[PDB]
Design a binder for this molecule. Structure first.
Ligand SMILES: O=C(O)C1CCNCC1
Ligand SMILES: [Mn+2]
Ligand SMILES: [Zn+2]
Length: 442
């Protein structure tokens, strides 16, 4: 079917006017567009991509850590089992660490070596992919991060309309920038973004990347495929067989990202990517204030619990911050947030009264300014307001957080734990009561 190889939603920018034109923002965040490729973005804004060249990076922070993925150089769009007998979903991808200086050396000699060969089923060559380079430190990366403030607001790392800005604390690689250093064949295997948040990716060049994209509403189909190939959709490295997806009638968007092109991945869009040439990429996440984004984010948050996977975005904490600090005028988005908060409030009230009825002291603990959300030290679920801390950890003021279930499993009557409360119930009830639909004519 021709509908199984759809055209890429693509926008061609010439100048700053095109980049700041409001319909660009609305096109990207439109749920009907699973991905938007903003071509010519860097040139349109006169972004200095040279600030992210490998030469520039070595000079700035040569001992900076790089996560290496050692992979096989696979042909085109395929993934073969090590023997070259059949195409499979499972990806070989071993992890190690290096530095920018050391990876840069490899990146350069890799190119020099291919130049020489050019002038001279498997088996497959091994390559190294430099991933997840952390560009959060504004002191180490001052000029780099300043250049990215030249983007239109909706695509920035930080903006008033970015849900991740409203989290109130750092979520590494989501509201901070990640850098990738690549050689041909460097693969980012299949995935959805952390808690289905949108993502921004800019190719630094000089080489191209090739992207494969599947709309959000087909993700269950890909989840089935993983389970049938004994793979964990969320935690395994997998590279879809295109002939399998075609067979199962899954449409696949396919395109080339050139240097300076910005790729916007909409919420929950499934995708995998490979370098065609030698290049660097930068990326981060963004959370538009839309019903679709909030809905998919909450869904994945709950799915992660069932799968025993930690949510990088603390959706309970975020939901309270939205109610505290954001005027919400979309009736659909408002009703979702209101609903979630009511769930949180009722569960908290239920737990709190069960504790008080069993004669357990709830200790007023309050909270520090700009203090991050808490997760259970055992099971890594988000824990909100009522924190379960051992008598000893309390005494030592290390305040090591457990959820209620994990505390109970350890200590049947919670005799080994104190219950800390970070918010008065009156304060949360008030925040909820005062959270009402704002009027907007837009
Ligand atoms: O440039 C890359 O390898 C990536 C693209 C999309 N998500 C994660 C990584
Ligand atoms: Mn991604
Ligand atoms: Zn727990």
């Amino acid at each position: 079917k021709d509908k199984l190889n759809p055209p890429t939603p693509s926008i061609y920018l010439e100048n700053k006017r095109d980049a700041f034109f409001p319909p660009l923002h609305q096109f990207c965040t439109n749920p009907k567009n699973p991905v938007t490729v903003i071509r010519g973005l860097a040139g349109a804004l006169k972004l200095d991509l040279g600030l992210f060249s490998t030469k520039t990076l070595v000079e700035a922070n040569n001992e900076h850590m790089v996560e290496v993925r050692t992979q096989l150089l696979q042909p085109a769009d395929e993934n073969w089992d090590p023997t070259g007998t059949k195409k499979i979903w499972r990806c070989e991808s071993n992890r190690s660490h290096t530095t920018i200086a050391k990876y840069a050396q490899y990146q350069a000699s890799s190119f020099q070596e291919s130049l020489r060969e050019e002038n001279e089923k498997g088996p497959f060559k091994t390559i190294k992919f430099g991933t997840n380079i952390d560009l959060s430190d504004n002191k180490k990366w001052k000029l780099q991060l300043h250049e990215l403030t030249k983007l239109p607001a909706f695509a920035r790392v930080v903006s008033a309309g970015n849900l991740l800005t409203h989290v109130g604390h750092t979520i590494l690689g989501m509201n901070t920038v990640q850098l990738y250093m690549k050689v041909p064949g460097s693969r980012t295997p299949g995935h959805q973004e952390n808690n289905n948040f949108c993502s921004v990716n800019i190719n630094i060049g000089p080489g191209d990347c090739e992207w494969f994209v599947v709309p959000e509403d087909y993700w269950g189909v890909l989840n089935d495929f993983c389970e049938k190939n004994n793979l964990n959709f969320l935690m395994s490295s997998w590279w879809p067989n295109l002939e399998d997806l075609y067979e199962a009638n899954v449409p696949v968007y396919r395109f080339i990202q050139r240097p300076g092109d910005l790729v916007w991945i909409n919420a929950g869009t499934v995708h995998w990517v490979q370098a065609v040439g030698w290049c660097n990429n930068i990326a981060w996440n963004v959370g538009p204030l839309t019903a679709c984004q909030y809905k998919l984010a909450v869904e994945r948050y709950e799915w992660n619990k069932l799968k025993s996977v930690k949510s990088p975005v603390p959706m309970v904490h975020l939901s309270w911050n939205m109610a505290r600090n954001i005027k919400v005028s979309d009736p659909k988005l408002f009703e979702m947030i209101k609903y979630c908060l009511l769930k949180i409030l009722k569960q908290y009230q239920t737990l709190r009264e069960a504790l008080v009825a069993a004669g357990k002291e709830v200790i007023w603990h309050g909270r520090t300014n700009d203090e991050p959300a808490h997760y259970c030290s055992i099971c890594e679920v988000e824990v909100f307001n009522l924190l379960f801390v051992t008598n000893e950890s309390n005494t030592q003021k290390t305040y090591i957080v457990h959820c209620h279930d994990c505390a109970r499993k350890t200590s049947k009557s919670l005799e080994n734990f104190v219950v800390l409360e970070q918010y008065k119930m009156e304060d949360l009830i008030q925040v909820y009561d005062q959270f009402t639909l704002a009027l907007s004519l837009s």
